[PDB]
Structures are given as structure tokens and as C-alpha cells.
Amino acid sequence: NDEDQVVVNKAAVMVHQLSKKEASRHAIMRSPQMVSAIVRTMQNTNDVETARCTAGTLHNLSHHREGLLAIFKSGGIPALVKMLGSPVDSVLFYAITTLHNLLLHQEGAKMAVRLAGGLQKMVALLNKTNVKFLAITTDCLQILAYGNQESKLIILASGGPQALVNIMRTYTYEKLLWTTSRVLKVLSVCSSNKPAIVEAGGMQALGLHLTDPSQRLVQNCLWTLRNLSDAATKQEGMEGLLGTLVQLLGSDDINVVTCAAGILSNLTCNNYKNKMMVCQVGGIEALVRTVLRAGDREDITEPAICALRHLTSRHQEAEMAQNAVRLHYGLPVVVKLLHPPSHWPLIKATVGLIRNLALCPANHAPLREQGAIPRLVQLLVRAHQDTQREGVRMEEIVEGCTGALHILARDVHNRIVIRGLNTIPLFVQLLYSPIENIQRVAAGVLCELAQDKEAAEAIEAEGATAPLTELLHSRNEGVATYAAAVLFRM
């Protein structure tokens, strides 16, 4: 039969019972007339049992493909969103569930919800306390934000990051934690959201769940953590997270290992506090084992080497880390990574690690015995030639290899090897480099070599007096100091 009228609700309790039975439910969504009256009643009524009964109806309809369209074209979406402002409590449930079904299957619902101001309403509801309601709400936000930078910035403005992090800090309900982590993951790739997540303590919060039995939750937290750690700030209370990350390096899951290495790489970069802690929980040993176990998987070795590079310089236990790499059988494999099939990013990271390891006198001989010097020379020679003829710039390979050789040249037996490879003409040539940092390490390695009279003569014979004289007036104070140092020993 036809519609309700005015001042009567019994019709609301009417349409319900039928929406349950399929038979009438088909008739009801097959009727593009009263479905609009269902909507009209819901948004407008100030009665509780009528409002909840009305929302519950549309819910039952959202289960069927035509029931969606029925609600869709009837303009039910802006109504349901308005029902997300409804007070206690079951009306919020039917509303968010219906929207969810629409967002899942019904096409056009996404943009429609966005236009209705659904994003703002949903973010506001993240302070509720029902985990099932929060799981549905967070999933909607995920559906709306994925591959849609517009929605991501809205969620940010509405205070999404802080609310989502609080959920991760509060609840233990797996499905909610998982769903919330997927939203944070989507937001993590956003350049605007990422710092907000980090500022909300997102990294510590995600770190809480890295030992959860749910692998999909663990992996989501890892993926998000890598994006967030990607140039994050100086955070406190990272002790537990760092300890777990080192722990996760031994995981049998390669994707867990890849993420753990990457995050540790990012968190240790220019952060001596994080360097200390990672070292103090066995980071070197774990990272070395990881490199050995990884073989030629550069997805793993590259962030692992990078992490090792960070840990082996500029912090209180740097020297200890430099020894630790050797003590844990690391030197042979590190040198091996300078050879094919290693690609430039790994090679660059490896060279930088050798440079730090060479700071430790006890590493001079083993590095020499492994054949680091000729390989470093071959890299430098070929890299330089290529700079004379985007990814990794060869100017970085040139500077890196020359830098590593600069440190290795502190050892007497190394200087004989380096010199024996006819490198002096190359080094002198590098004094003409447009790049100051290259001039600096070129002058530096010459300064080390020129401590031996025979080398000092070969250096002078190479016509190095003139370039060094010009570099005396370099605005780079370091370049000038080395230039004067070589001149003196000549």
C-alpha cells in the first residue's frame, strides 16, 4: 500500500518488518517513491524509535544491488551523513553501515559522500568507544581516502591523524587496529599527513603492534612505519620500537625483514641517540647477519648497509660498531657488494660503509686483504671517466671512493697498494673538480700519500703544485687546509 501521512509513525514500524522478509523488500526498493519518504521521515523526525526504525530500514535495503541505487538516486546519502550527527546511539550504527555498503558496492557513492561532508562527519566519530562502530567508520575513511589526495587533506584538516593514532594506542580489537592501520598507511604517503602522523606519536603507536599475532596488522604497521620514518623528526620514547625492529630483522618473512631494515635505516640517519640504542640492542650483529642472509637481494642489503653506515659514524659507540662489523664476520661480504650484480644505490651505500669501517685501524688490514682497494679504484676510475663523458650521480661515486681511499690511506701498506695502482695522476686531476667535496677528499688522499717521500715526488712530478696553490684560496676552509698540507710535504 501507499505512503504514510502526517503525525503518524506506526508506518515507520510498518516498513521495517517487511524489509526483513525478502518478498516485500524487493517490492519496497522496486518502489522509487516511498523510499524517498523513508528518507524524508528519517532526517526530519525528532522521535527516537522512529528515527532508529527508519535508518534500520534503509540498511536492510542496502544489502541488495537495486536497494543501493534506490537509496542512491533518492538522495539518501546526504541524509545518512546528517544522521552521523545523530545522538545515542543505534542510529549512528545503521547510518554508518548503510554508507559503508554504498561505498563498497554502489558506484558514485564515494564522491557523493565526500560532497555531503561525510569525511568531516566520519573523522569526528573517531572519538567514539564502540570498536565495531570504529571498525566500520575507519574502513569508510580508508575507502574514501585511497587514491584521492583531496580526501586525504580533508581528513588531515579534520584532525584525522591524531584520532587514528589514539585508536592505535587504545584498543586491542584486531579488526579495528588493522582497519585503522590501513587508513594511516594511505595517509602516510601524503606529504602533508605524514608529519602530522609523526607529530601525533604515530610511530610509537604503530610500534606497539609489531609483535601482534596478526601478520596483516604487523605488515600494515611496518609499511606505514617505513613511509613515516622516511624523513621523520627527532622523537622520544623510540626505545621499544627500535628494539623490536632489530628483533624483526631475524624474521623468516622477507617482507618483514625488508621493512625493518628500511625503517632502521631511516631512523638512524643523522640521529646519534637512535644510533646508540640500535647498537646497544645488537643492531650491528643483526644487520650484518641480515646482509649475509639476504644474498643478492638488494631490497634487503641496501637499507641494511645504509643502516650499518649510519651506525658506524658520529656517535659515542661508533668505534665499537666499526669493530663489531669485523668481529661478526662482516668485512668479506661488505667488500663483495662492491662487485656485480650490485647496482649503483647499493654500491654507493657500501662504499660509504667502507669509508666508516676504515676509521678503525684494525679494519685496515682485513679490508686490504679482501681486495677493497683495487675495486674501489676501479669504481672511481670508471665513475670519473663517466663524469667527463637521474638515479645515482657518478660524482657521488667519485667522491665516495676517493673518500674511502682517503681513510684507508692512513695505513702504510694501503698507501703502497693505492700508489701501485697508479692513482696519483687521477687524484691530481680531481683537484680540478667543480665540486668542493671532491676537491677536499682528493687533496686529503694526496696529503696522506705525500707523507711518503717517494710518493710526494711522484705527486709533484704529476704537476700538482699549481692546482693545490689555487685551492689555497678556496672558500671551503677544509679544501684549503689539505691543499696546504700537501704543498708542505712536497
Curated annotation (Swiss-Prot):
Keywords: Acetylation, Activator, Cell adhesion, Cell junction, Cell membrane, Cell projection, Cytoplasm, Cytoskeleton, Glycoprotein, Membrane, Neurogenesis, Nucleus, Phosphoprotein, Repeat, S-nitrosylation, Synapse, Transcription, Transcription regulation, Ubl conjugation, Wnt signaling pathway. Its main location: cytoplasm. One of its GO terms (cellular component) is cell junction. The modification Phosphotyrosine is found at residues 171, 173. Two separate complex-associated pools are found in the cytoplasm. The majority is present as component of an E-cadherin/ catenin adhesion complex composed of at least E-cadherin/CDH1 and beta-catenin/CTNNB1, and possibly alpha-catenin/CTNNA1; the complex is located to adherens junctions. The stable association of CTNNA1 is controversial as CTNNA1 was shown not to bind to F-actin when assembled in the complex. Alternatively, the CTNNA1-containing complex may be linked to F-actin by other proteins such as LIMA1. Binds NHERF1. This is Catenin beta-1. Residues 1-18 are annotated as: Interaction with BCL9. It comes from Mus musculus. The chain holds residues 161 to 662 of 781 of the full protein. Expressed in cerebellar granule neurons (at protein level). Expressed in the intestinal epithelium (at protein level). Abundantly expressed in the tooth, skin, lung, kidney, eye and brain with weak expression in the liver and heart. The modification S-nitrosocysteine is found at residue 447. ARM repeats lie at residues 1-31, 33-74, 75-116, 117-158, 159-200, 201-229, 240-281, 282-324, 329-370, 371-399, 422-464, 465-490. It is found in: Cytoplasm; Nucleus; Cytoplasm, Cytoskeleton; Cell junction, Adherens junction. Key downstream component of the canonical Wnt signaling pathway. In the absence of Wnt, forms a complex with AXIN1, AXIN2, APC, CSNK1A1 and GSK3B that promotes phosphorylation on N-terminal Ser and Thr residues and ubiquitination of CTNNB1 via BTRC and its subsequent degradation by the proteasome. In the presence of Wnt ligand, CTNNB1 is not ubiquitinated and accumulates in the nucleus, where it acts as a coactivator for transcription factors of the TCF/LEF family, leading to activate Wnt responsive genes. Also acts as a coactivator for other transcription factors, such as NR5A2. Phosphorylated by NEK2. EGF stimulates tyrosine phosphorylation. Phosphorylation on Ser-31 and Ser-86 by CDK5. Phosphorylation by CDK2 regulates insulin internalization. The gene is Ctnnb1. GO terms for molecular function: alpha-catenin binding; cadherin binding; chromatin binding; disordered domain specific binding; DNA-binding transcription factor binding; enzyme binding; histone methyltransferase binding; I-SMAD binding. Disruption phenotype: Sympathetic ganglia-specific conditional knockout mice lead to a reduction in sympathetic ganglia size and in progenitor cell number, but does not alter sympathetic innervation of peripheral target organs. GO terms for biological process: acinar cell differentiation; adherens junction assembly; adherens junction organization; animal organ development; anterior/posterior axis specification; apoptotic signaling pathway; astrocyte-dopaminergic neuron signaling; bone resorption. The keyword Cytoplasm applies.
